[PDB]
RNA sequence: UUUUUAUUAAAAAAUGGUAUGUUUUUUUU
RNA sequence: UCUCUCUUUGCCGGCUUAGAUCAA
């Protein structure tokens, strides 16, 4: 229906749609996904695909930074997100992957996640992960859906500027034959 | 009339389907019909008019001047609408349909709806006294069961899960809401009430 | 180039619209009664716990 | 599976769990080549309650072929034949009450006239036979006979999943009836033995070739069976009034017939509710007076098939007699 | 006044202040009886400028319309 | 000038064009452009290639929709005088924008506009304000760190837990796996989801994304369980909330809408948490609302607690009460999120504490404007309801002290009642006595003796000298000028002074980093020697408190006025006169407002519903607090008539002759309207000079809204039982219930139903709640008042009953004798059918009748695309049939004013325009119908005629081909068929169908001749036995005739009524002819006949249940 | 202590709902 | 001084509630 996992296709159009129409038309660009809606587009926009996410690996600096102020501001990620400089699912990630690893390296010398054990594991959530690779043959929908995009792209000119120039195109021809008219009598 | 163009319609069900166009144009016409116009052009008189035809009588002459008939004076609205209101007669249907006869109870009571057919059973010889019954029947009780809702083979389901005036109207466009409903009620009086409540 | 509208075509690279920003330029620092805070409600947790 | 509900002469495809047999079936059928393990998505507690075998379809199917059968051989008492197992006596009612209000019965429950016999000799059902039985005093078996060989070969139609459909819409846009899918149906049959056989024409116009095949076979053998009672099968109807057709399509279709409401449902002549199949052509023409054979009913709608227009007057002369 | 005012004149010879706008009308304030009078309605655009002849019973206005 | 237009041209050029209001905006651009343009050719020096205006222009567009967005628009290479003057000319637009947006707002909360657009388009600058604003606030705590101190948040913290251990307070687990009531809580959010919508067809998006949801969660249910638990114990980053404002047009309403499935799970942990939190005491029971009452019932325990105080009334010794009313000023945006979560973990489980406040630090989002909330809390969670109880239960701490707050709520394993203590000795031990949090409204009452209010006041004066006696000017704030004064607060030099000691030892109380009191909100009422009476408003009601003792006054015991009883000597002591706040008027008042100017009020249901539910929801809170109040009548009568208006103006004719009441007041299956009536009634009226000093009996009467003629308009409020009776009741019939109980306990019996048929709906919890089916599973929907009150912080609906459910209450109002009333008042079905074309439509009898909603041919075009133009020819529909419906007293002769013109083709005569009733008419006619009729009834006149072929004057008999134009002009009428006679008779005078004593042999008459003229008769003029007769005496007495014969007979006919008649000269066998024949005429012509069902068709107006059924 | 009197309104046009734009020669030499 | 090519080369639709909305 509706939603997915953000093939890497969905991605790249999601970026050129981005580069030609702007950070606040998101429902004239979710127009060109069928999958997804504006919302989704506007989320994934700003939590994994503009160019201002740092995907490198974390330096040191950071990782401080991050740990001094998830201990100021214990949850509250939206806020720690700016200062650290990442987003905040990446900031909540990598301080539970730090967590995780100190658990790890103490079971050797040796938090309670037998509450978050009791159950399933995390669901990811969807507009954060990286976009699946394409297949060689990735279906055939995206064809459609690819052909569609590339025609809104360039197509420019408005809409209802196709009417005068069509137009005087026709008055071209009707005066072409008139003098033709005129020539062979 | 070569049904005009069909290739219009395609799929694209009905939140999709463009608007009904009298002439392939986008107008409504009617007064009931949501048209700002009604008749010919807001008119009742017709394109080419309308007389009477002669009249003479002359005890001889009146008799070519015959009576009035329903046709003569509609038009295809009303000859459709005159159509689609004819319903009638039926009789031999209902008297040899619905529900004959079935449970001991009701054969005492109940009327057998069969009627002929319980001549046509003199035929056969029924002499059921005790009525007999198959396990198609038990599955005709799944008419009445369920249909599964997708669930497991073993799954008990849940009982809190389970569920089941007059006058002009606000505008088909206009929707449904708290505000639509009937003001002054007096339904439901004891089937979703209890007769008694545990006190312990 | 404005992230609102452009009446012709006219793509633009992301490099010149995340550029026109003053984004920068507005800072991004939090004070230090944060620290003093944090530090005194955890502290008061502990003992009135213990 | 299949249920056919005969107080509603309809027929739906209901969920059921599976019998004790099906489970043994379905376990042993792995481990053919090599060893196989089989994984039942319930408890052993749920297998103790399953009934072992399923019901025989002469239990679970339309007994009103089975009651002409035994008829044409001459039992008078359905009761005295050797049933392996009881059929329910209400399904036999309601085929006996429909035979006999279809005239193959009399009062007694006997074959009527030579109309009752010859309808026990058609492998067919008795209603679409009547229409074939009937025609020979309106001399125009011919197109009837077509229509009956479509309606039991099958659907003649080809609908893509892909992108084809509007090709395939296009490709019946030329045989579009006003009239209904019955007379669409007889133009498609006429003009496609007027295309040479051609299997790329049946490609193009997304026709079934193998149910317009098997109908020329069952219509071959009604012949024969027509010709068994000594019936000429060269009258074929010079005029294009279809309405006589359509008197025996009526008096074959009796029971079928339905009034469009202004809620957009018909009503059966039964009184029941049903709606119209978005397959048939006539899906919003708001027909005034429509005429069906076939009723399949989903979990909140009766859907019929098999659309044709009809006019009301020909329904009051034909039910006044 | 619509629209920003652009001028100000008050008679030295009558009991009237003169005031011009963007609005494009200029208005005669009867200052006995702090009210509009009179209008003065031809000008294509805003008016920016008002002035008072000193001797005669006439005014000036200049505007955006290339015109005085 | 037309002349001139004519022989001259247009001499358009040259000639200027005001600006009028819609050119203001388009005219203000130009002139900044320009004086852009001009600012830059200046500031370029010479030569610098001039040519640079237009990217100018542009960057000056771009850096004021950042501004309006909020966006800083910092750009690289702009040179800096272009820039200065862009920023210069942006300021300036933006104070333009600015100090419109101000202006339109206080236009439209005085009520001076009706314009959509213009409330849409100042909606839209004041979100935009308000956005800058908190953007700019959050920025500062961000700057300024935490408002409230360290040592401000251990004192909280601690006496939190102090608090908390005094209870022996066990925390909130975490659901475990193994929960019993899981699906129970499930089931309950699941269905408070889905009363947010209907079976309408405009869900958007994320209304079908959240009805999939749903769905799924019923269908599926444990998977749903285990998604939301997984969420709770893991997801800490939600998605970003759209933000958006409700209009009140007194006050605006964030509205939050989230994400469907965190929609779900918030709702889930809503209903866990205020379940648990129920049954393990954490709420100390003066917290509101709550599960217990409603809010009038609330205002009632308090006058009735109030009163029950040991000595409360008694002033002899100098002892002051004060009841300081009070709302904690801005506490939602200064709710440290930090603070809150450590707060939060000590109720519950570390989880839901971390997943609760994370919760509330989203990203909020307005079209392009967008922020992160970190400082203050997001009313629209689902939860947020419970997160704000106990922040403010720890305000309460902070204002009564833990001492007084353990003496008020009493021992946790034994609660106290709500205002009561456990005995005087701790009752009478501290100057506080009642307390109440509602929300965020607080309510304390003082009770000092002599000497504490003295040293409150001097220690109030000693840190706030008052040299200039100041205090007095400024007291109470206009707010309680609706009470005559001798009834307000008398202005006593002490008693100012007690009150303002009060609010200020109540303020300092309360740090100012986390909440404030404002003195504009504030009003402390003093009861003492000087003043007698108490004053208070809660929740929507103004209360006056007047004890027996201070009375010395004799005044009748009106409805409006409460009898406060006494405990202890269960005697009446004294009378609290109740009435409707200002801000109560007012919110009724919007309220018709927004219903008038809305998308649904295009037809005349729709908008006659919409009266109906407010009136119902205004009268039903308020019940006798509405009567006592006479601007409500007034503006009940103004809002009623307006509401009538917009039906009259639809119909593009105001008169009042043509809408009778019974147009709008007939019941809706009858073809009216509907519309429930408040609003004839009697206004009283006092003398002026002395109303606003004392309270003088009425001596005249002011009539309300007026109806024509004589007729008795039944009231509303005469159908709803006021809430003191209703309280009386309620407890009677619980402490019999709760007797009955125990004499069924005693014995193993069951309680049954028909025990208690007597108080079947009685009540306040009504009595049929205990014998509900689903009575187990709202066992554990617990805090839902609370909830229900929320919700308007969610949906952008108004809810028009939040104080009640009809699942806890029960049905509290049974209006169904208003139905028969009112069909009785208007006349009964007989005289209300009398203006309809009920007869017209030829059905025998009235009771088999029903309507159709819906045509069908509506149904088919309910989802379909369709252009502006259809969708208000659909909109229209329903408007058209309801004229067609009334057209007899629409189209009444008896007008005021109104040209006469007829129908073309028609013997319709129209006064007015009425362009719906016109449409309608024509369509009835839409062939040539009129005339088809009359010439079809001359036909079947013709064939009885040839039956009876010999008879008398049988010497002649020929019917005239008539002019086409004659069955439609009223002028005159040319001759019918015509009879001349073999032979002389003797006739007289000429008479009607009804006679048997008739004399005719007075005149010596030899031939006759018989017309038929048709008519459709309104409701005023439609006795066709005058209109014939005065029709025959005119025609035939006329000098000039077309009619052979000298005298003859005329029969009409009244399409309207379809009734008949004749007036002519009788001949034996003729008159008895006519009299059998036009009866089987008007049962079978066909023309007749295909009106009537074109008629019925019209109307949708169809036959009884089926035959057949 | 006997009696009273007090009576708003009110219909037409354009928005608004059979867009619009096009469209025929007497001289050459 | 011609011809060809390259390179340097300063360079030449507006407004409002983002107008409002949007499921095969």
Known sequence: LKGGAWKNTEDEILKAAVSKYGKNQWARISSLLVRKTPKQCKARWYEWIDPSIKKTEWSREEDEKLLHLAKLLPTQWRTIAPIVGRTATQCLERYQKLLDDLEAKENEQLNDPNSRLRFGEAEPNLETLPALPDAIDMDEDEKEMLSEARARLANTQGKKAKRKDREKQLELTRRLSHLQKRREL | ?200 | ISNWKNPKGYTIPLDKRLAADGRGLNDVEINDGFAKFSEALYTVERQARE | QRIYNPYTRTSKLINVPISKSSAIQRSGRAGRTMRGKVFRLYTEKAYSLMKEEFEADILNCDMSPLVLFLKGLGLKNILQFPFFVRPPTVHLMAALEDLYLLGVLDESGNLTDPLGIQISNSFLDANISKALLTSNQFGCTHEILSIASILTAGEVFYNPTSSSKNDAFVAHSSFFANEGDIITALNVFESFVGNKKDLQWCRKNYLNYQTLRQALDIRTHLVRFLNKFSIPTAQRLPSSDCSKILKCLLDGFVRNVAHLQNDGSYKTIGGKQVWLDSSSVLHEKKTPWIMYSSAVESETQIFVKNISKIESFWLDKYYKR | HIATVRGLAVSPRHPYLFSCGEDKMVKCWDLETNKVIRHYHGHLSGVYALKLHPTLDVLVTAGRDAVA | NLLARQFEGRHSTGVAKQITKQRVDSHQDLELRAAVMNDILDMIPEGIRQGKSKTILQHLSEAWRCWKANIPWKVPGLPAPIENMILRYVKSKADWWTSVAHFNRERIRRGATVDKTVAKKNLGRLTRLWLKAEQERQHNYLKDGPYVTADEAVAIYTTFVHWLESRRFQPIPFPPLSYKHDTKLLVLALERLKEAYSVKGRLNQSQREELALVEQAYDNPHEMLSQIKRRLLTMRTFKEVGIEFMDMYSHLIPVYSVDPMEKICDAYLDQYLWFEADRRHLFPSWVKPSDSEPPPLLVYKWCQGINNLTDVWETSNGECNVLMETRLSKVFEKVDLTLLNRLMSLLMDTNLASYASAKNNVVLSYKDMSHTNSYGLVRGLQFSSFIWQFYGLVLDLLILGLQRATEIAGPADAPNDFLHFKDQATETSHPIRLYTRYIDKVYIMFRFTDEESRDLIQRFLNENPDPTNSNVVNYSKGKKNCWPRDARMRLMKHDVNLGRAVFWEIRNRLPRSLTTLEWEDTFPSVYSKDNPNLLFSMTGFEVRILPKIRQNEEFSLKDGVWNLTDNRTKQRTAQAFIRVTEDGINQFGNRIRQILMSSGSTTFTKIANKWNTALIALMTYYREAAISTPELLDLLVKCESKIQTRVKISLNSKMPSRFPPAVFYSPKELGGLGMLSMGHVLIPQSDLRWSKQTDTGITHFRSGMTTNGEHLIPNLYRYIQPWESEFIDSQRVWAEYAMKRQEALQQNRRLTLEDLEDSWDRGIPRINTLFQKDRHTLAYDKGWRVRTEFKQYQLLKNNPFWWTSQRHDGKLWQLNNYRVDVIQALGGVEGILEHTMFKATGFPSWEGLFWEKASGFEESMKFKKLTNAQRSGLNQIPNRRFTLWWSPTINRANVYVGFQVQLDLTGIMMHGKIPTLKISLIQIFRSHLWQKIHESVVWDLCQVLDQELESLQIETVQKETIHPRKSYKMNSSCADILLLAAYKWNVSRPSLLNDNRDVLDNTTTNKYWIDVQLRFGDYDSHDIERYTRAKFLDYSTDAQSMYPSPTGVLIGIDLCYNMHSAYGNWIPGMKPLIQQSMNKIMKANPALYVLRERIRKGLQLYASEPQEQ
Do not use: C
């Open chain 2, 1 to 200: 009339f070569d049904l005009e163009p069909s290739r219009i319609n395609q799929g694209v069900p009905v939140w999709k389907q463009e608007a009904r166009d009298e002439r392939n144009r986008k107008r409504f016409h009617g007064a009931f019909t949501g048209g700002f116009s009604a008749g010919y052009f807001n008119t009742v008189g017709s394109k080419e008019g309308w007389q009477p035809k002669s009249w003479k009588s002359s005890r001889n002459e009146n008799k070519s001047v015959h009576g009035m008939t329903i046709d003569d004076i509609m038009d295809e609205e009303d000859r459709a609408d005159q159509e689609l209101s004819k319903v009638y007669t039926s009789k031999i249907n209902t008297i040899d349909t619905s529900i004959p006869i079935d449970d001991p109870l009701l054969r005492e009571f109940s009327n057998r709806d069969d009627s002929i057919g319980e001549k046509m059973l003199k035929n056969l010889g029924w002499n059921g006294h005790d009525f007999v019954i198959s396990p198609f029947q038990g599955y005709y009780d799944d008419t009445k069961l369920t249909n599964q809702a997708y669930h497991g083979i073993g799954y008990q389901a849940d009982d809190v899960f389970q569920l089941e005036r007059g006058g002009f109207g606000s505008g088909v466009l206009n929707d449904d809401g708290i505000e639509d409903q009937d003001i002054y009620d007096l339904g439901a009086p004891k089937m979703r009430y209890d007769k008694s409540i545990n006190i312990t």
